[PDB]
Amino acid sequence: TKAIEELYVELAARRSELLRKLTETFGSWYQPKYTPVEHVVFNPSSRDHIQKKLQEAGWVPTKYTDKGAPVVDDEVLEGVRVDDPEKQAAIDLIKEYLMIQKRIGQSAEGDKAWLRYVAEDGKIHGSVNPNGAVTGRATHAFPNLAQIPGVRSPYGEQCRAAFGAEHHLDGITGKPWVQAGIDASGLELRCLAHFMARFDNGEYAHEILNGDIHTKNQIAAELPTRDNAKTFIYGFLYGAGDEKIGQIVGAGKERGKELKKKFLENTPAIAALRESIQQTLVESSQWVAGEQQVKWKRRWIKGLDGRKVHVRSPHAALNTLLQSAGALICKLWIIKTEEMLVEKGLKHGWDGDFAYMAWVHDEIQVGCRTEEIAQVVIETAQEAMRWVGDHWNFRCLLDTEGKMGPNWAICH
Amino acid sequence: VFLYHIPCDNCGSSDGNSLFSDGHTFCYVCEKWTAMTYNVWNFGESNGRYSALTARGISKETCQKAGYWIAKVDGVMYQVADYRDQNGNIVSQKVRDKDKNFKTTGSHKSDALFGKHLWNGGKKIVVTEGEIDMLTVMELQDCKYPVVSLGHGASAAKKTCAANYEYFDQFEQIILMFDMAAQVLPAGKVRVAVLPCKDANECHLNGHDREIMEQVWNAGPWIPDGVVSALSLRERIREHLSSSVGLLFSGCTGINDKTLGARGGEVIMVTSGSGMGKSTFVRQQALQWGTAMGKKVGLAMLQESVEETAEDLIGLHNRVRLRQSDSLKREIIENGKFDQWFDELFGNDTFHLYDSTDRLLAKLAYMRSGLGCDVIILDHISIVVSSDERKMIDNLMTKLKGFAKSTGVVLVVICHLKNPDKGKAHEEGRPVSITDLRGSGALRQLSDTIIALERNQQGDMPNLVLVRILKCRFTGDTGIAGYMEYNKETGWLEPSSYSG
Amino acid sequence: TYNVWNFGESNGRYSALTARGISKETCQKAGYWIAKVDGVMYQVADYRDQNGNIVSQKVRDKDKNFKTTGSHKSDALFGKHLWNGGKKIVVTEGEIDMLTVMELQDCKYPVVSLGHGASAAKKTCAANYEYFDQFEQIILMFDMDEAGRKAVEEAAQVLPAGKVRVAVLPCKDANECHLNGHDREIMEQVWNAGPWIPDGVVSALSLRERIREHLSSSVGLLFSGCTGINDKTLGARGGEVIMVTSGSGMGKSTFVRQQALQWGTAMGKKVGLAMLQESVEETAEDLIGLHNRVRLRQSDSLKREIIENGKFDQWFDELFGNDTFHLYDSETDRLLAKLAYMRSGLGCDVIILDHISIVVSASGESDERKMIDNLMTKLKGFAKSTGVVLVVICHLKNPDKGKAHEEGRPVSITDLRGSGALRQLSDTIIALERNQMPNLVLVRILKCRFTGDTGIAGYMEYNKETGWLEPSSY
DNA sequence: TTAGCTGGTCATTTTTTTTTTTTTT
RNA sequence: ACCAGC
Ligand SMILES: Cc1cn([C@H]2C[C@H](O)[C@@H](COP(=O)(O)OP(=O)(O)OP(=O)(O)O)O2)c(=O)[nH]c1=O
Ligand SMILES: Cc1cn([C@H]2C[C@H](O)[C@@H](COP(=O)(O)OP(=O)(O)OP(=O)(O)O)O2)c(=O)[nH]c1=O
Ligand SMILES: Cc1cn([C@H]2C[C@H](O)[C@@H](COP(=O)(O)OP(=O)(O)OP(=O)(O)O)O2)c(=O)[nH]c1=O
Ligand SMILES: [Mg+2]
Numbered sequence A: 001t002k003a004i005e006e007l008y009v010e011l012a013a014r015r016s017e018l019l020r021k022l023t024e025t026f027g028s029w030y031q032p033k034y035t036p037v038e039h040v041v042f043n044p045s046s047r048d049h050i051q052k053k054l055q056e057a058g059w060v061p062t063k064y065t066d067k068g069a070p071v072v073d074d075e076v077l078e079g080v081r082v083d084d085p086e087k088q089a090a091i092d093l094i095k096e097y098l099m100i101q102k103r104i105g106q107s108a109e110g111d112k113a114w115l116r117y118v119a120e121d122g123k124i125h126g127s128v129n130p131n132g133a134v135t136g137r138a139t140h141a142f143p144n145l146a147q148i149p150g151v152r153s154p155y156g157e158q159c160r161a162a163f164g165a166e167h168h169l170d171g172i173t174g175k176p177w178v179q180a181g182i183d184a185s186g187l188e189l190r191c192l193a194h195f196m197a198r199f200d201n202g203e204y205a206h207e208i209l210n211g212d213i214h215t216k217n218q219i220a221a222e223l224p225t226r227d228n229a230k231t232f233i234y235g236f237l238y239g240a241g242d243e244k245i246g247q248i249v250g251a252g253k254e255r256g257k258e259l260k261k262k263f264l265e266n267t268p269a270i271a272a273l274r275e276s277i278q279q280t281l282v283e284s285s286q287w288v289a290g291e292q293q294v295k296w297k298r299r300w301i302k303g304l305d306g307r308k309v310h311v312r313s314p315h316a317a318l319n320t321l322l323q324s325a326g327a328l329i330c331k332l333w334i335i336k337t338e339e340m341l342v343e344k345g346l347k348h349g350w351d352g353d354f355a356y357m358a359w360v361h362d363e364i365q366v367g368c369r370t371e372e373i374a375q376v377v378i379e380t381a382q383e384a385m386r387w388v389g390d391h392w393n394f395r396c397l398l399d400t401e402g403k404m405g406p407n408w409a410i411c412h
Numbered sequence B: 001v002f003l004y005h006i007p008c009d010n011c012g013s014s015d016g017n018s019l020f021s022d023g024h025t026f027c028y029v030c031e032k033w034t035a036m037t038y039n040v041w042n043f044g045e046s047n048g049r050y051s052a053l054t055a056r057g058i059s060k061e062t063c064q065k066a067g068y069w070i071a072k073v074d075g076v077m078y079q080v081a082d083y084r085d086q087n088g089n090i091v092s093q094k095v096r097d098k099d100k101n102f103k104t105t106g107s108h109k110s111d112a113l114f115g116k117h118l119w120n121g122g123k124k125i126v127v128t129e130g131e132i133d134m135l136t137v138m139e140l141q142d143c144k145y146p147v148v149s150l151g152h153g154a155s156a157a158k159k160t161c162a163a164n165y166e167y168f169d170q171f172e173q174i175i176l177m178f179d180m181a182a183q184v185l186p187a188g189k190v191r192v193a194v195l196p197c198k199d200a201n202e203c204h205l206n207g208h209d210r211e212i213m214e215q216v217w218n219a220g221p222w223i224p225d226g227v228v229s230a231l232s233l234r235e236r237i238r239e240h241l242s243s244s245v246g247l248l249f250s251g252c253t254g255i256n257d258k259t260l261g262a263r264g265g266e267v268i269m270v271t272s273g274s275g276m277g278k279s280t281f282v283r284q285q286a287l288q289w290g291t292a293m294g295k296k297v298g299l300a301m302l303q304e305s306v307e308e309t310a311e312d313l314i315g316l317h318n319r320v321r322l323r324q325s326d327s328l329k330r331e332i333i334e335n336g337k338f339d340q341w342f343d344e345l346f347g348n349d350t351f352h353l354y355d356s357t358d359r360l361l362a363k364l365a366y367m368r369s370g371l372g373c374d375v376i377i378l379d380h381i382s383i384v385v386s387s388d389e390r391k392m393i394d395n396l397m398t399k400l401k402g403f404a405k406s407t408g409v410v411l412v413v414i415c416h417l418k419n420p421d422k423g424k425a426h427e428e429g430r431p432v433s434i435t436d437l438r439g440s441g442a443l444r445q446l447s448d449t450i451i452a453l454e455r456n457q458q459g460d461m462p463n464l465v466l467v468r469i470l471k472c473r474f475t476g477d478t479g480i481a482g483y484m485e486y487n488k489e490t491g492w493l494e495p496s497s498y499s500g
Numbered sequence C: 001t002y003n004v005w006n007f008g009e010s011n012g013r014y015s016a017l018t019a020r021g022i023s024k025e026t027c028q029k030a031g032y033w034i035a036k037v038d039g040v041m042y043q044v045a046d047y048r049d050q051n052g053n054i055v056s057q058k059v060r061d062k063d064k065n066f067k068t069t070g071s072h073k074s075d076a077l078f079g080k081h082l083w084n085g086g087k088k089i090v091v092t093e094g095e096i097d098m099l100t101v102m103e104l105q106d107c108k109y110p111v112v113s114l115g116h117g118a119s120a121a122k123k124t125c126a127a128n129y130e131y132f133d134q135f136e137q138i139i140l141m142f143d144m145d146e147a148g149r150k151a152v153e154e155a156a157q158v159l160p161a162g163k164v165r166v167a168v169l170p171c172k173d174a175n176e177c178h179l180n181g182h183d184r185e186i187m188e189q190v191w192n193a194g195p196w197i198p199d200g201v202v203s204a205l206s207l208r209e210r211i212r213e214h215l216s217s218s219v220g221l222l223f224s225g226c227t228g229i230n231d232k233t234l235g236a237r238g239g240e241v242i243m244v245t246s247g248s249g250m251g252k253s254t255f256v257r258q259q260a261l262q263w264g265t266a267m268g269k270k271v272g273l274a275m276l277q278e279s280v281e282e283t284a285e286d287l288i289g290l291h292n293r294v295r296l297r298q299s300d301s302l303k304r305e306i307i308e309n310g311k312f313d314q315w316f317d318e319l320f321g322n323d324t325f326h327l328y329d330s331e332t333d334r335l336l337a338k339l340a341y342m343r344s345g346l347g348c349d350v351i352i353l354d355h356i357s358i359v360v361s362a363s364g365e366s367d368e369r370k371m372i373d374n375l376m377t378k379l380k381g382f383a384k385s386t387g388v389v390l391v392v393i394c395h396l397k398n399p400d401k402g403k404a405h406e407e408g409r410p411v412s413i414t415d416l417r418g419s420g421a422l423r424q425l426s427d428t429i430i431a432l433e434r435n436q437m438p439n440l441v442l443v444r445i446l447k448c449r450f451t452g453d454t455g456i457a458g459y460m461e462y463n464k465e466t467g468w469l470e471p472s473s474y
Numbered sequence D: 001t002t003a004g005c006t007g008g009t010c011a012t013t014t015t016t017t018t019t020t021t022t023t024t025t
Numbered sequence E: 001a002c003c004a005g006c
């Protein structure tokens, strides 16, 4: 709690400087309420005042999402140029003010903030719905512990360093504990190699096991970062358009077409799998110039354990075929990685040797008493994942990766 | 509270409109929201406009939530602040202007607070004394943490805070921001923080607003009263260590070997028989403190007036006897040599005089604080004590010791002796004891140094005095200090060479 | 305000009470009902006389306000008319408690209620002396609060003795014990209640545990500088007043600061000093050199030398390493509040009150003697209630003839200055005498209440180079 | 003809009795 | 509508 009150008292004395420095630059104006006027001032949190003040300072948007208004976000507040060299520096302060406002409203001032769900013993209890999405993915609520800022966003490490497992001093020796975090690698991208291995005879599920996939994909597609390559590959895979994967590099629809052709002509089995799904589910789709009228044949899909997975739209069928089969292997893995630990001779809970703390969509965070217990957990997670991969006869080879640390900033 | 999304109708969106449990909807795209005087000023009558304050810094939503609205009645600008109750109804108002002409309308109770109608449960509370600091703390914390404020000033702290006792009892930590005090609140719960400016607004308008928010979340505990521990004195014990030098007595060096002079906060009692030369020794000590060390000296002679002691000082510095010679007074008034003696003494205005029991201490306090004197000399305390005289002289000595303490001023006091019971007289050569002081027995308990003079006017040598230290609370050495011989021609009592 | 509200003209209805725990049968029996006037439902209770005629309404809202419709007497009880005798009554405090008790007994024992509560219970019990004479046992059932205990203590005086019994409850009153399922305890407190025990009187038989634990804990706290002082007085104890006297400048403060040093260093007790002869800058300054066996303020050459070499911080750390010294700087009402804050909050065990002659002469009073007596008895009451070692310093007065007290005069016990109750309410009187051999000081124990041996206790010498009080031989 | 799955944000004139000083018979 | 998460 102290390490987040220090953060709140730090960056609550920054948005009270980014408005003082900014209202003297962007002045006030009379706005019509005999003509009744009022003296309204510049509010940077609004996306109308910035739109007006950039409209009357010499900027043309050339991007019209709304029918009479432009779009204003972080990707057009970078590519904006004005004549006055003061406003060119003021726009960066506007973006920093919006970031600080979102940080404050998430951390400490919201209705569902972190400091309004801390119990007497210094712990946060958040509800986790195991089946909240239509594809078997768990949802997190009151508060959401799967939505805190990562280590790549600004003020991210200072927000994840408070959510540690070394803040629990032991009740019998007065010592802090150790945290182990285990993440699966290439989960839905390896489920794809499971599902299409009957088409290309299994010569795609061998390159995934031969070295890292996203690093060599970044090498092959000359993306700047591994995170951008990882965003791009699933953006291409889950049915994008001509522009929404050219926007990842910022280029035009020419590059947005040639990247689709380059990653479609490598393995010509994704289109065959998509045609198989279309021939299995849908039978006829009448076209309307503003809508779509479809006569269905099977609205549901059998999952990995017979569950009728519901399909919302016929172009998200590959999505609800991949992620609904990817969530269930993690859901069995989190069960088996304690069914082996209890049978190994340990004790679950705070008065034992280990305790689960949070389960976000891919990785698990467990906190344990000694480093040898951490090593036992980080060993048996692999055996649990391999038993999951053997129980359902996957054509791939599943594998994870674990880290050890004091808090959830090294164990990300 | 947020429930789910409905499709909006004005903008035609799909998942823009959000429904709530209170019955109202809100769209995030089209931004459309759905659903004295003893006279309370009506909002539709007084032309109520929620304008903002530019020169101090207050947003519009803060004035809409707190109820601090500008009226445009009578062609002028009034600032009406509203007080409410726990049910949320208008009880009283305050109409404030540029001339601060307060017009408190309605039923203004003794326990009214500003901002108690929105905030009833929580953990921490910040209490201020005005309204502008309350709005400043709400601007810093974005109107979401419990802040209340008083309604009768900082002088009704024993009445307003005491009447509201079950209201403040619901909160866990009560933080005060009055002045940079009341104990009626329950103990172990009250925190008081310190800011480098007068209030919170002078910290907000000058860049110290961060130091506001650091004093809210980490406010220190309440020390109850002026008692201190033995660790917070650590610098001041150093500071008094680097201050404390004794003012040396002249005429004899035997005193300074066993008295160490005079220090700050030091009442020194001087006595002898009836007419044995107290005023001569005190006047010589006054001259040697005035013209030789640069200390500003304030006399308060009550026996004689200003002109006598002025002429005696002028005659005494020039090694002569001024008033005891008509020929010298007739001489120095003709040739104009008097200003040569006046300017060499009173050039750097070190001397201040008094022209003759509660107004006298006020005049001494004005002489100490306003003018800046360092050594105050009184004389002949028997007039000031002229009901029961023991109680008067005890209260007088207590007030003089209280004035000398915590100021750092040397205070020289002259007293006499009573009639002896048997034996011979004090003026004929009787050795004086410590319990010979008249008026009470309180003069020897509050005096930090007692000096007595003895001489024999009808003996063989009527100009050889004996100095006797009766009490010394600093060193503890008493007895005969030395011998001094009085001059019949120059008025200078000087260190002699006789041994008894 | 107008008149007695009729139930027809106010839409009355006799129903149950769900959130309180009272059924409709008991409300039908008593006459507690609900009217509908001014839109908001208002509950109303009925007052009757001894005959049975309606004399008053009592109207309560949804926000707990009171409203009397007319003449409100003091001899009117809520629940009195139904019974005209019996062998056992139960008197409550509020008004719902009567319904609570008559709910759980099916109207078998007479239960009455008070018309004012606990604030004006003595007035409504003094005028109701004649109604309780026809009864045999009375069980008072009040709140378990401070006002409830005060009302049950002050209301049992005007009642007849031998019949008033007081019951205790684990709840606030009977209603929370009705709600929380504690219906087995309130039925035993009616039939078997506590007998007479007013506060102030203690039986000699029921005092075994306090006398057992009292001789177990305090005692000790030896003096310093001499042996005969502990041979005669056996140290200083909790709840006593030790009064040290001398003349003028005879060493009445040096001995006390030496004892404070020995009791703050060698034994680890929290010591609270109230020095009024000097400021806080001096009384915390001489302790440094006194612990380092020198005279600090009495030498100007050593002060600069301990400023320069940094040894002053070492001397401050080796003495004040613990929080064992609490100072005070300078009406007579707030000083005892400071002493209560030193005793209850901080936890001091030795409190020194130096130079008392400037807290009785600095206050504006016509008569000094009554102020000295009141201050002394209130200070003794404080030291007896809290039980703290308290040293007080006072002075002597002028002798009638002979020598002076500052030259070796043997002091008597009537030489205490100011009054004659300074020796009647003090528990030990120690006098220090010397003659200016300027350092041979003798100690006279004038009065000891614990032991009996008085007189000459010993001799000491004051060191002019270090500052300690050394024992001598003579 | 479409990257996908979630969460979180917001607005209205005389008596009697202790105690401290100081003349003189 | 904006941000954040996997
Ligand atoms: C980034 C991203 C991942 N996913 C999927 C991919 C995974 O199956 C799951 C979590 O993604 P990640 O854990 O971020 O990626 P990864 O597991 O494939 O790679 P690595 O652990 O080696 O760093 O969610 C999306 O559906 N949309 C997305 O935008
Ligand atoms: C010191 C001294 C003074 N004198 C003279 C000079 C003084 O002016 C004169 C007495 O004048 P003061 O000194 O003024 O007399 P005093 O102050 O002692 O007594 P008090 O004020 O109560 O009346 O005595 C001597 O004859 N022999 C001496 O030794
Ligand atoms: C007892 C004694 C004290 N002294 C010195 C020490 C101190 O400087 C001074 C007495 O110390 P203090 O305790 O300050 O004097 P005091 O308390 O008796 O006086 P007061 O009634 O005004 O409070 O005398 C001796 O020289 N020899 C001694 O035998
Ligand atoms: Mg992963």
Ligand SMILES: [Mg+2]
Pocket (backbone or CB within 6 Å): B278, B279, B303
């Ligand atoms: Mg004189």
Ligand SMILES: [Mg+2]
Pocket (backbone or CB within 6 Å): C252, C253, C254, C277
């Ligand atoms: Mg003293």
Ligand SMILES: [Zn+2]
Pocket (backbone or CB within 6 Å): B008, B009, B010, B011, B012, B013, B016, B017, B027, B028, B029, B030, B031, B032
């Ligand atoms: Zn809309």
